[PDB]
């Protein structure tokens, strides 16, 4: 859990790395009481007997928001994040586990290793990491690698530094969307 | 593999204007990183600042405020700089580097030129 | 300003040897270093960055380790192709800065 959880670095919005971590003991017991994760939404199941669910293959989505940007990640809230970023379809059935990372994400000056699309040409599909940042073009003026007039570059820079608040602060999150259990003896 | 080269040898003079520049050869171009460093001789790498080869972002140091400024030629994929109000102490090696390539940004050089020498004298 | 001063400025070794390097910051850092490799009369080389990673194309002997503050550079036999200076440089916070440079020479 920890590598794919509280690792070095993580991955912007655009481009979550969902790491399947199955096919050994799921102790989220552990996870449940260590508790280093300020949020634990777990949608579809329940997180706290999650260790002994046994399900068949677990998923990892990998990528740092905003602590404004962390709540509109949701199954069903769409936003810049759930319709432009990382898309949450409504039939989650894992967990979304948030905590602040400033000591190993945020670098002073804003995170410019994380970029988000603000302006994404085409809206996000469920569960889809969009890496083309084409410009967005806004109904005239076909901007397809043209930059001006109703051309807007989807990929904006993460402003993430430690001086700023929790709610424009790097939030590590590993959602495990399940589709791997306890003892089992 | 990923190259970069420059410019050669320049020999500028106090209170005038200089401009090195350096192409790029890049399997892609996903937001590349065009990353200027200085290296006086011999002595401290001291950091020159990071124009962004996706599309203008122009982030510059503390110590060259107001003074250093960059940009790219995108056809050409070259990255050009202004380096202004030269001075004696200015006299150095001029480094591009970056090229991240796998991921969009980094802070690292990983791709160096083979080098820049400006000399400022009277 | 992020502080960066490295020990010794300069050491000594014999081919086949270990060669330890410490880079010093007087303030926190959070394994945001790499370190360079700088030949006379040339461009730098990087071959740790993170202040872990070994990155590809080098050889096997480079070594980073440390956190925190105290950060630490190992090589473990001596190459002729190791004769050089060696950089550390932070990441952490701006304007990054790089350390005073460490080179070995040939003992006799």
């Known amino acids: 859990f920890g590598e794919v959880f509280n690792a070095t670095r993580f991955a912007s919005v655009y481009a979550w790395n969902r790491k399947r971590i199955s096919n050994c003991v799921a102790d989220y017991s552990v996870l449940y009481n260590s508790a280093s994760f300020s949020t634990f939404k777990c949608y579809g199941v329940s997180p706290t007997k999650l260790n002994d669910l046994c399900f068949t293959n677990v998923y990892a989505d990998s990528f740092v928001i905003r602590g404004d940007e962390v709540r509109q990640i949701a199954p069903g809230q769409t936003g810049k994040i759930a319709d432009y970023n990382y898309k949450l379809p409504d039939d989650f059935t894992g967990c979304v586990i948030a905590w602040n990372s400033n000591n190993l994400d945020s670098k002073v000056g804003g995170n410019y290793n994380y970029l988000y699309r603000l302006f994404r040409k085409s809206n996000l599909k469920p569960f889809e990491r969009d890496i083309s940042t084409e410009i967005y073009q806004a109904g005239s003026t076909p901007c397809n690698g043209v930059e001006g007039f109703n051309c807007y570059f989807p990929l904006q820079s993460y402003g993430f530094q430690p001086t700023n608040g929790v709610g424009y602060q790097p939030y590590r999150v590993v959602v495990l969307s399940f589709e791997v259990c306890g003892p089992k003896k | 593999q990923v190259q970069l080269v420059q410019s050669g040898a320049e020999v500028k003079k106090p209170g005038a204007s200089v401009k090195v520049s350096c192409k790029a050869s890049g399997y892609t171009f996903t937001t590349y990183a065009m990353h200027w460093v200085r290296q006086a001789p011999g002595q401290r790498l001291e950091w020159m600042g990071w124009?962004?080869?996706?599309?203008?972002?122009?982030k510059y140091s503390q110590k060259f405020q107001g003074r250093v400024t960059i940009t790219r030629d995108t056809s050409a994929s070259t990255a050009y700089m202004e380096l202004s109000s030269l001075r004696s102490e200015d006299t150095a090696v001029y480094y591009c580097?970056?090229?991240?390539?796998?991921?969009?940004?980094?802070?690292?050089?990983?791709?160096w030129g083979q080098g820049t020498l400006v000399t400022v004298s009277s | 300003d992020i502080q960066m001063t490295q020990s010794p400025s300069t050491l000594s070794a014999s081919v086949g040897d270990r060669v330890t390097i410490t880079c010093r910051a007087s303030?926190?850092?959070?394994?945001?270093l790499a370190w360079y490799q700088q030949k006379p009369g040339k461009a730098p080389k990087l071959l740790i960055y993170?202040?872990?990673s070994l990155e590809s194309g080098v050889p096997s002997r480079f070594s980073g380790s440390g956190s925190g503050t105290e950060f630490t550079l190992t090589i473990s036999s001596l190459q002729p192709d190791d004769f050089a200076t060696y950089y550390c440089?932070?990441?952490?916070?701006?304007?990054?800065?790089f350390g005073q440079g460490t080179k070995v020479e040939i003992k006799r």
């Open positions: 993170d202040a872990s």
């Open positions: 440089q932070q990441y952490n916070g701006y304007p990054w800065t």
């Open positions: 124009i962004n080869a996706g599309n203008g972002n122009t």
């Open positions: 580097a970056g090229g991240g390539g796998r991921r969009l940004q980094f802070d690292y050089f990983d791709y």
């Open positions: 303030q926190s850092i959070s394994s945001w």
